[PDB]
Amino acid sequence: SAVKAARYGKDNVRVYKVHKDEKTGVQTVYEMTVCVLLEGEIETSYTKADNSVIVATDSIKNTIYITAKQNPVTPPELFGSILGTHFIEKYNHIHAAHVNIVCHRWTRMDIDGKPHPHSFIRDSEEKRNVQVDVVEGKGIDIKSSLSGLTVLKSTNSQFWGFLRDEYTTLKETWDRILSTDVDATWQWKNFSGLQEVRSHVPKFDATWATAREVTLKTFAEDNSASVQATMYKMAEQILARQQLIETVEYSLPNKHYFEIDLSWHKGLQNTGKNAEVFAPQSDPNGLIKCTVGRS
Amino acid sequence: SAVKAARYGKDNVRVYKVHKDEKTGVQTVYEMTVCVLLEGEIETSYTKADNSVIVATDSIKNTIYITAKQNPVTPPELFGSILGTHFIEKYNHIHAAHVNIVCHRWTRMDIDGKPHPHSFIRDSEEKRNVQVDVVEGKGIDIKSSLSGLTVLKSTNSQFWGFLRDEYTTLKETWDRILSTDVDATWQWKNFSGLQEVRSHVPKFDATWATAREVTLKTFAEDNSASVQATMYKMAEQILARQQLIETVEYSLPNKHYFEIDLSWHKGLQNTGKNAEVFAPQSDPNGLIKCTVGRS
Amino acid sequence: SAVKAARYGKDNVRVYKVHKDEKTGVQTVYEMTVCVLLEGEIETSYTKADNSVIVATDSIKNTIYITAKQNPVTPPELFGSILGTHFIEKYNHIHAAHVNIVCHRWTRMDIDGKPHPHSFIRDSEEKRNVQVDVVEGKGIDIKSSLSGLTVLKSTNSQFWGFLRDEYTTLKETWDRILSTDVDATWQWKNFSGLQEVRSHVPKFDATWATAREVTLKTFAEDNSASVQATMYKMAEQILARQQLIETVEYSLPNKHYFEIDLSWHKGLQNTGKNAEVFAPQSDPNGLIKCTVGRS
Amino acid sequence: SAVKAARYGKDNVRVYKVHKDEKTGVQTVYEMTVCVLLEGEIETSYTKADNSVIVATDSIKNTIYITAKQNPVTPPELFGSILGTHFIEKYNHIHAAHVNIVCHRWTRMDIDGKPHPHSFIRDSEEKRNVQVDVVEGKGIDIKSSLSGLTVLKSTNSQFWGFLRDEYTTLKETWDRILSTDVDATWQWKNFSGLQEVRSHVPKFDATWATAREVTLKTFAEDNSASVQATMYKMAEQILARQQLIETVEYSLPNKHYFEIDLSWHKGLQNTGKNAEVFAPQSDPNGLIKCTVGRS
């Protein structure tokens, strides 16, 4: 037998950082969960019990805290690039670092119409994520994403004209509920190293904001022919607005809400144009994916 | 042996309702999870296999949908009271109904600065709940609550002057992070029946809004001596603003964020006044509760 | 306003303890999650910011580890009683301690037909729990339980003869699937203090084993007329086998598995006597409870 | 813009099937959760709102139930292969089907030492999974796995001799606790189609059993030099025992249990050779992966 692939590191490292403006008294907090996995010339730890090649996962944990102390943690694309580069430069025999960061929302509270200097609320479990792969001699590959953005529209979704055969029971519809949890990922062109990532720093927050805005507006305004058609419209717009993105991937569940026929009870009308009360279905769910790139 | 207590019903009934304004084209959605448990002269279903006394839990499920079709589902205090009253009036041998409702957030989207007519976002997993106990001859008892409101302040929390003995290692502090998930319950005076609940309908949404506002402002503005002292201030204010509330109960975890001593690494300073990077602790957590009533 | 009730402490304290037999080399592990909440003369911490009355929750955490180091952690009824008694005896102004323990399964592995000396498997998420309330001058109240015991029988469950009215759509059946997650609690007679709890130590593990065995055998062998009737049979037997138990409470979900009519597809027969493929329903679910005591 | 990749289908389809032996009266149940995603000539549903190419996800759901009615559902490798093949053969424009199956445990109850004919228990949340990719003209690729197998050993694990530098605080140890949740995947050689999969049917259950047995015995008996070294030993043995497997992948968290220094309290000794009480850590955790193939 032979080791074909190996990676190891530390997962689920929770990190909080506070920034304190001495002039204004305003504080800003960041909270993330970080995973770092390393690859390199480490096969002998598996095959020969040679621990000399192992940077202990506990040390990886320490390094994450030290790096957060000495560097900006925002935008997460930058922090992830700094963290991954550290490992490949510091250790001769480590040749790739894989950094995943999940950013948790701490949104500044408004009290009496004014932003509070040091109080925050978790407004939703929506996350902003990055995956950064730093590979020696091959640069820095970054995939940015938003996830856990849960939306619903109560009309202006249709689904008709699909294939009908002996396995089909679904009725065509011209008015249904559409609800989903949005997972959207944009993949940046390869960067040559940290200097290049640093050169593009302002684009990271701006592109996240654009991706979010395009997703929300398109969902709200499209008279949707299907999840497929609506998601493609979102991806097309993101690619148009940021030239440094190579591909956009969406993964969308179709979280079904079923009509409830109540006509058995005193002829109560609750279907079609008379539908008011629906039964949300926990499972199963449609799952629709697409990756959109440039012509 | 004898049956000392019994209750049965349907849990986890998901319900969605849409309201459509024909004049303006605006749609408003409500989504809840409902549990209804019944009590009454039902012992023989347990002791003698006498199913004749059982209103099937499937029928309870149907009744929830029918009731939602025929009645307002907001405020949830009213809907719960209507639903519970139905069971005790309809069935001679059912003498109490226990209705629990969890309301899920569907907040209207703003697109380009204007409220969208039929698109919604789940902004946080904060819930608004009710527990309604309808008991034949004893009226309607309602407990309203908010839960899952997650907040953090990065300074203006202290904890010193506590008991110190041979079990104590905790250092006194004059500046710490305070973070919690708020669970707050206000218990209404007993209502004589549905007519009385109907008479107070506007107070339900207004009191929820007050409870939320008081919680947020007090958390943000109190220079907190302890979770205990801050929570008492919240409860006192709610009781002052709504005379029809008898008690307010808070249950607050203290979600700890620990300093990380990095001085072992190149004398890096990250404690006390120099603390910037902290380690959020998933467990254990303090848990602090109090019920506040009137003198 | 006045403080009507207050309790505070530490939740989610994970504890592991190992016992090592020096003679045989056999090791035995215990893992639990512990919560301890205290009550007493502590109102002033809430009303006056008087922390002098607060035993810090961090100190409660330390005490749990110290107590586990110095005492047996099994049976959990005993450990909980020792832990609660400590707080009311040590602190003059603390008058009640509420201890909740969840015991996690670590079952000794069999390798090649022989029990391994120091390797364990988590065989299911079934838990054994205790709630111990130690109240100064009022003794020790213990509720023992098992939870998370998930079972299914594929036949020998019926449900017919229930109330039928205009809200009823459920068909009577003489053969259905029955599946549930068992939550069973037995409440001991009040104990005067630790000496009395110590006197009954062997009864705790034996009664847990009896409760589990009675639950499994009754579920498997009863030709069930309803969840109600089957659960009552379980409770009756437990009360018969242990005189020191005052009440037994069961709380059982009815986790539905629905028939799927496939007759629309080539007249395929999959209902009634021909039912082979079913759709498990995640929600809603029936919920049936009963508390059984002595005549 | 252009569609670079697309797949869509139905996720979270829960399925139960019962087999009834008429001769013996013995019943056997199977429960799974199934996901099926399709690929093919479907770009126009995204780009042109052309639904004519869409096999509705609802129809995919129906097909799963129909297929389960007409075919064995065990071993899951076979069922997944039948299900995937159906889609590529039935629909001209569908060229790949991706089937994921999670099998849930329903283990026959022993009552009074004898196997019960129709009663089952969920003994642990361990799963047996398959991923089957059926690609037109390219055969059938199957990855089989077990997951959620949670184990702990209380001694006979070591970790010393790792890299030490200025980021290192971890002490070397010759005796620690090792606990993990095992995720193990074996990838079969490509099969030419269903006939070939059918030819190897007995190997599927036997290889799963071997993988499980090798994992448990190796974990229990290895005096482990590291997670890396122990996992490699497991993989090597599986590859030796089944020639039709090409690679074995393990992904193992290192779920840490920390010593608790209690010496501050009356010089209590609870570290090193005196360690009895430990603190399980929920996070962070090491994460160690390896893929082992043939020389």
Ligand SMILES: O=c1[nH]c(=O)c2nn[nH]c2[nH]1
């Ligand atoms: O088994 C281990 N492998 C590792 O890579 C490691 N790093 N810290 N502790 C560890 N234990």
Ligand SMILES: O=c1[nH]c(=O)c2nn[nH]c2[nH]1
């Ligand atoms: O066992 C049952 N008990 C009930 O109360 C019930 N209601 N619907 N189905 C049921 N099954």
Ligand SMILES: O=c1[nH]c(=O)c2nn[nH]c2[nH]1
């Ligand atoms: O606010 C607090 N209240 C308490 O009771 C406590 N105990 N430890 N830290 C604490 N913080």
Ligand SMILES: O=c1[nH]c(=O)c2nn[nH]c2[nH]1
């Ligand atoms: O938007 C949809 N896309 C689909 O592929 C589908 N299949 N069923 N319903 C559906 N809705």
Ligand code: NA
């Ligand atoms: Na390197």
Ligand code: NA
């Ligand atoms: Na009545």
Ligand code: NA
């Ligand atoms: Na006392």
Ligand code: NA
């Ligand atoms: Na095809």
